[PDB]
Amino acid sequence: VYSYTEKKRIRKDFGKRPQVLDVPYLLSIQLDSFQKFIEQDPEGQYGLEAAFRSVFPIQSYSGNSELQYVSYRLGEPVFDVQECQIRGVTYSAPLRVKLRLVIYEREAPEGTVKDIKEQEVYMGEIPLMTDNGTFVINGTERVIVSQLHRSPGVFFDSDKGKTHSSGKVLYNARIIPYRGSWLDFEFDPKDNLFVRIDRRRKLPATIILRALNYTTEQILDLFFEKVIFEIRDNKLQMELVPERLRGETASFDIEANGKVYVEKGRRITARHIRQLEKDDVKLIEVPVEYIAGKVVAKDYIDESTGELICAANMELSLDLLAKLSQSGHKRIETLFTNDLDHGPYISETLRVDPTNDRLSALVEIYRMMRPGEPPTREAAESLFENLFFSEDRYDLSAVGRMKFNRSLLREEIEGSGILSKDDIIDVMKKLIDIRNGKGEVDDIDHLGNRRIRSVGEMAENQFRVGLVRVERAVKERLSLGDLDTLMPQDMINAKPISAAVKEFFGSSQLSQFMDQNNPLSEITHKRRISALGPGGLTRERAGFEVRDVHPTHYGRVCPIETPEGPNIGLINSLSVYAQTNEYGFLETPYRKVTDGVVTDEIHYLSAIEEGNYVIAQANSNLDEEGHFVEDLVTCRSKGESSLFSRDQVDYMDVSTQQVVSVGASLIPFLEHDDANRALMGANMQRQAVPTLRADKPLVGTGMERAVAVDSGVTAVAKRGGVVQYVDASRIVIKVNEDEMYPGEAGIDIYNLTKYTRSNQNTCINQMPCVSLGEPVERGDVLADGPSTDLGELALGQNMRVAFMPWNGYNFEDSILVSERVVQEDRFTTIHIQELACVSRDTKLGPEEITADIPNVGEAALSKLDESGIVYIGAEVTGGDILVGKVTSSLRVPNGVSGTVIDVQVFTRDGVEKDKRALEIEEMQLKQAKKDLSEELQILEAGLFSRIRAVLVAGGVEAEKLDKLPRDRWLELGLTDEEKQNQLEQLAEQYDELKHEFEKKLEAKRRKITQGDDLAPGVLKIVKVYLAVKRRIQPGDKMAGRHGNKGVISKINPIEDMPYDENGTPVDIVLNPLGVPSRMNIGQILETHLGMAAKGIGDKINAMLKQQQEVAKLREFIQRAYDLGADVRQKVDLSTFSDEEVMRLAENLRKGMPIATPVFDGAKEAEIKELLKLGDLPTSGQIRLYDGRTGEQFERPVTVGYMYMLKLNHLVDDKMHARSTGSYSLVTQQPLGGKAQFGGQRFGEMEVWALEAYGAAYTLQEMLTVKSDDVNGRTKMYKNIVDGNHQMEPGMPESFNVLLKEIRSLGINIELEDE
């Protein structure tokens, strides 16, 4: 335990709850998606082949032109990551797919004439996934976010209190397939079933059921129930069902109990309902009127004439009574309806339905789909069988089938992919039963109704769209294909697949930039769950229900991480311990809790399954047996935080960090602050900016260790070993014994990324953090990137703080900064700006890059070389020409400054390369020779040792052996034997390896020395990188880790700042009148803890500077690392070393790092104990002394260490003014933006302010002279430059533009008169 890299800074913490499961791989979402997408699989359940099989093997009409799938092969990586990123080309890879082509015998059984099997016909170029989990397209890095949408399937909805100003609660269902058209079953305020296509005209829902080959009697029995009637002798009558009889009245009297029963007119209670079974009465007597007061069910046909007696769904009337009496039918069947048990919805909707034939249904559907079209039998049949009865134009996924079956109390999760002719009836019956008052609808808030679409799913969808859109041309070509005179190469075109994949990856709604300005931003931009995009909603159409949080987000979606603005609740962030389900849902771990024993075995539960069990809370003590140390515990069943019995729980949370995400878990003492500022703090930690030399945060959360490890900017030890050579950019690590591959071997090499441009014009670098002659274990850090320190995440710096007003400079939210900060250079940042050049071809003449341009003196044309490129490392200023080009002075833009650090040249055939490009090529070739030669030598030493040891046997010397060279030993001979045979074999291997490395170096030189492809119509591309060295200054924005923002007001001398009794000055001073209002009390405890840490560090530094003995330091460290209550961090310093203790103490001189988990932080008592351990006062408040008066204050003031940061809102990037600049073209008006000399926009609401005053000439010259008058402003300028201040009216040209646009529109308009 406590490896060498995990030992230099042992971070003390306060952990009560012991850990049971560490944080998994943070980027296991996008990498998992792409891995599952790209891996081939003989079982086509997913991946590429699952998409090929749907579009692949096809057939022609009758020409026996069937192309069929066999296999494919992934193309080799053409380029690497670094060089291809420098070029600006996609990090793509070929895709060679094998296809077999057979032609059956003409008008015969399957007699294959020819079996063309073209070897991996070429098609498409798909990009690849970076190890960090990004993409490379055009030099940038896209990050495909995870889109959240609705689960394809069936559900129910409740439109309550919507229309008609009544209490109508009409319901509706919706069948959402994975691809196709929606189907809606809605009600109306007049109790009729209405079916609708996606958003088109409504119509009675019985039409689609009539269009499914059913008869009216079957339709009516399929929903309602029959009523038995029989003519025993006379007096037709209905039998008695005890449940049907329940919920009725005594129309005449209920025939039970033989003759005497419930009186005339009653509400039959359950007593008589039970009497019904007590006297088992079935059928005695019912009069004719109560029977006639309802509707018959089935049809009847005359027995004599063969005519119809009546029709289905017809009420009984005296004429029908006469017709049935004269016909003499016993078995009559009617409909048992009820306002509370069996609604007449089906019968009424069938009665309102005007049609009765299925062909009429087809005609009506075809007319509703395509109006004004001739109703054709076969066309309507094909449309009805293709709408959602086809496999190609309709496809419901297996997850959709599972959801559909689970939502209808089914058992088997299998089935077809399309809708059967029974599921419609099933969902209709379910909707009727719900309307009857059973069950309830499901709102779209439960995460079981949501599914996170990943990168692989969208890629497969776009690839399938490409396949199905090229299949049309494939079929068109094969319908008229030739016998054998051509291969499938000419049959297929690779254009549409590449076009579609480039359209989806390059210019989409989800593909976007990534923020490389902060490793935290890089790790939080990938674990982001959006709700926009195709299929989802938009930014302004909703709403109020989809924005709030539902109690199922606990542990699955972070409740307290979202960008505040027009999109709240739609850009929610994914939790820490969450995991992607196999289906695509959200799983979160839980600890298995037996009767009394809490087993450390973990599980995973979905969202729908959680609503059945009960989950305990991590804030519950236990002791070696899982038994609670309480009598009962707080739990929840369904959003019900209450008290349950102890021996009833089923599961318990893993850790307290399960509710929050990485964006908030890095905020210390979060349990004391409101979310309104925790959100701002979590965003400002994301929007940080790196510095020159980062520093460890004294108040950490413990999570800062497991962030930079899985981040991009780091150097993970692939295999442990010993440091051999590390100078500035390359690291040589000698491989250990047991970590060696068989056969040949070697060492691990590493290249460190030096100063290059990020996506937000921020610097980046990788500096070594180890010493020569030092071991290293596999899986450790080697080089720290930006804002990193020995594998610990460190965003900003830290310094003192004081909570007191000082001459009102901290008025609202301002921040005071002493000159010591800018003098010590602790907040100085680096910015890299890239400027490019073009060299195209015109018909007047090719664009030259000559270094001679007239109209300027020799002072401007002094930094350039013979080729017109500025010298590398030249201090440039504003307006200095950098690129000499003629038919063009690409000079420095006005405002930027700095120096030049790198020159890039990209050329095409036709124009030779200058000395600069040849020098760059030679430098790259020299590096590629140096590294390959180092590898060659370090591996050749082994073979020379081998041929030495072979020569040792028989004849060898010692002093006269190392004098003749190592190659001369191969020249030396020996007696013929297998010994000399091994010498010759080793010489052959030596020559083979030498020739192989020579071929490798030749190939590497040929790859780079050769020409480069680029955009057409341009020959030379010159990119120049500029670097700016800017520091802190007034107007900048700063903020801590608790949302406490502020702008720097003034920089004071060192002495004018307050100071304690020991003469030590005071750093940044905030305003103490923000804490009670904003309720961000958590920062003061952080301040006290930082003060305590710095006191301990000062004690350590004093004891080290007075050069005490190692025993005293060990004793003090044991004092420090053993305070507090029961914790898990328990080290023993009496086991490491004598030198390692000194190194650790030297590392701790800046201050002892203190970690603190989120929801079980150290209490106030332990804080005061650690204060008492030092030499600081208990209350943490010390007297001060004013730098002006030198007078003690009247109250002790709280001091300590906060943790400042630095944001991107730099004042020099916002300040922008302009007197007279360039003008627009369509309207003679100024431009906007800091670039291209823009001006401020005097908007509409500002006119209303001047309109409130009495300013007239002001507004006149505002929106008339300085804005639009092309003739007026020239005279105005000529008058101003001559001392005159006489304004002039005029004619707004924009008004003339409006007049011309209205006149060309076709409407006469013109100024009336003089």
Binding site: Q617, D673, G808, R840, T1198, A1249, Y1257, Q1286
Partner: protein
């Protein structure tokens, strides 16, 4: 639009015109060759559709054929819509001689002048600089003066200070909601790159220093200079156009300084002595002999308008605070002394300024507010009002009240499990008893905070008001109210739900101690609800105000 390198793009109208001309030529050709009627009717349909697409779009078939999923723009789209010609280039225009940056606070500035960076001033006033240079003969042609100001000589700074000396400017915050959104000030050169602004004026703009940006504008004609100096001058805007209440009310810091300045204690340094006037009172304070606040007999020479503008002097001997006598030094002639005898909170100083402008006039009120600002920041800096963890004392009765409420809810549960009452009645009784416990805890914490301080006075002890920092910040009315103190020290009561119901389990914890995951996860609901409300309120208010300003 001519793209670089020979090639060029085109607008959306050109495609429509080309389509119309092509179909017109095709119809002419079909009429020339005497085609059958079906072909020419099809051509007429195509031409009618083309003319409809040129005159409007998105009304017949949304036919564009311009690019991939991008409806082209037509004359209706040129005029109608949000970005139509009217709202883009007629009402809200874009004006030169402007600029923007980040604002910052400055204490040493009066309320009739604002700060200004040097580079912005040199860039905006270029014509005035050119005119003054070529008038003083320091440059022959305009090219000479342009190159000289590009070289940034030293004398151009003197020329700039001369030409700006008495030239007002305008300020403008981006969200303009009322008349006071744009005001005028007099610029003063300040080295840096950020605009400094007066403290008390920031209350009118409703713009904190969290990074808000403002805009500037320079009037050209002399009439505009007069309109700015007379109408839109900051000294003329002292009362809101909505209500008669002032707008120069001190908000946050100076109010705390004054509230700490005027309040008496039980025993201080040098209590019981006498003094002639406030001058030697300030002298004793600066010497350090007497404390800031103590009961001292002093003589004052007040005034009073006896007749219609006739002042009468008189003397007195009152028992008052040293700080009150010190504050009396900046009080003008017309105000009486009984106005500064109270604690001088926020409403107190508000009505003080109100009665000041009501009696004396404009310039006395302005200079009096200025002196209040200066002395308040001075004594607030010299006060040293910090905040610590000991400043929040938690009463010991909280645990017992919570245990009593727990016993009550347990008894109610045990009574309901036998079917004595209904679910709704049980819920109502539970919420009522938790509200009662909340009220008890609130009264207990208030009693603990307001009067805990007891200090002897020559032997015997006596109760008095408290000098707790959080209590001084709450009582003075600077920031927050009693509810926030209740939430910090005591429990925050109960919480609602997205449905609107109230959870029967209250938040039985303060913010000084930690909170379990459940209570924070519950409070997240209300946090997000408030955030969404604040997000949509502006989107509604914009359209509301636009309709109201258009109707009248």
């Amino acid at each position: 639009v001519p793209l670089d390198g020979g090639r060029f793009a085109t607008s959306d109208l050109n495609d429509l015109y080309r389509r119309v001309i092509n179909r017109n030529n095709r119809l002419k050709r079909l009429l020339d060759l005497a085609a059958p009627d079906i072909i020419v009717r099809n051509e007429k349909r195509m031409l009618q559709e083309a003319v409809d697409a040129l005159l409007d779009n998105g009304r017949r078939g949304r036919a564009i054929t311009g690019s991939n999923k991008r409806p082209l723009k037509s004359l209706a789209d040129m005029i109608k819509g949000k970005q139509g010609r009217f709202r883009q280039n007629l009402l809200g225009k874009r004006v030169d001689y402007s600029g923007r940056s980040v604002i910052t606070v400055g204490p040493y500035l009066r309320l009739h002048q604002c700060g200004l960076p040097k580079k912005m001033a040199l860039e905006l006033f270029k014509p005035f600089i050119y005119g003054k240079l070529e008038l003083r003969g320091l440059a022959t042609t305009i090219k000479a003066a342009k190159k000289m100001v590009e070289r940034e000589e030293a004398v151009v700074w003197d020329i700039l200070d001369e030409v700006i000396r008495e030239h007002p400017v305008l300020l403008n915050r981006a969200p303009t909601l009322h008349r006071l959104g744009i005001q005028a000030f007099e610029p003063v050169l300040i080295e840096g790159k950020a605009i400094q602004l007066h403290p008390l004026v920031c209350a009118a703009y409703n713009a904190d220093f969290d990074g808000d940006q403002m805009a500037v504008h320079v009037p050209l004609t002399l009439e505009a200079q007069l309109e700015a100096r007379a109408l839109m001058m900051s000294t003329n805007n002292i009362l809101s156009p909505a209500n008669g209440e002032p707008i120069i009310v001190p908000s946050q810091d100076v109010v705390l300084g004054l509230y700490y300045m005027t309040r008496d204690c039980v025993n201080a340094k040098g209590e019981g002595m006498v003094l002639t006037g406030p001058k030697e009172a300030e002298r004793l304070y600066r010497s350090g002999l007497a404390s800031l606040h103590a009961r001292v007999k002093v003589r004052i020479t007040e005034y009073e308008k006896d007749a219609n503008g006739e002042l009468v002097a008189k003397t007195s001997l009152k028992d008052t605070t040293v700080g009150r006598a010190i504050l009396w030094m900046i009080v003008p002639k017309g105000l009486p002394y009984s106005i500064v005898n109270q604690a001088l909170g926020k409403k107190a100083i508000s009505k003080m300024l109100n009665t000041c402008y009501r009696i004396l006039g404009l310039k006395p009120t302005v200079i009096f507010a200025d002196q209040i600002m200066y002395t308040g920041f001075a004594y607030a800096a010299r006060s040293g009002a910090s905040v610590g963890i000991d400043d929040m004392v938690i009463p010991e009765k909280k645990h017992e009240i919570i245990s009593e409420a727990e016993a009550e809810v347990a008894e109610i549960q045990e009574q309901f499990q036998s079917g004595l009452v209904t679910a709704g009645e049980r819920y109502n009784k539970v919420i009522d008893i938790w509200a009662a416990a909340n009220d008890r805890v609130s009264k207990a914490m208030m009693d603990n905070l307001q009067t805990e301080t007891v200090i002897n006075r020559d032997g015997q002890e006596e109760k008095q008001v408290s000098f707790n920092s959080i209590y001084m910040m709450a009582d003075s009315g600077a920031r927050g109210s009693a509810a926030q103190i209740r939430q910090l020290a005591g429990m925050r009561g109960l919480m609602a739900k997205p449905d609107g119901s109230i959870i029967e389990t209250p938040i039985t914890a303060n913010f000084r101690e930690g909170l379990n995951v459940l209570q924070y996860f519950i409070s997240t609901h209300g946090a997000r609800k408030g955030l969404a409300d604040t997000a949509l309120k502006t989107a509604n208010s914009g359209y509301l105000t636009r309709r109201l300003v258009d109707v009248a």
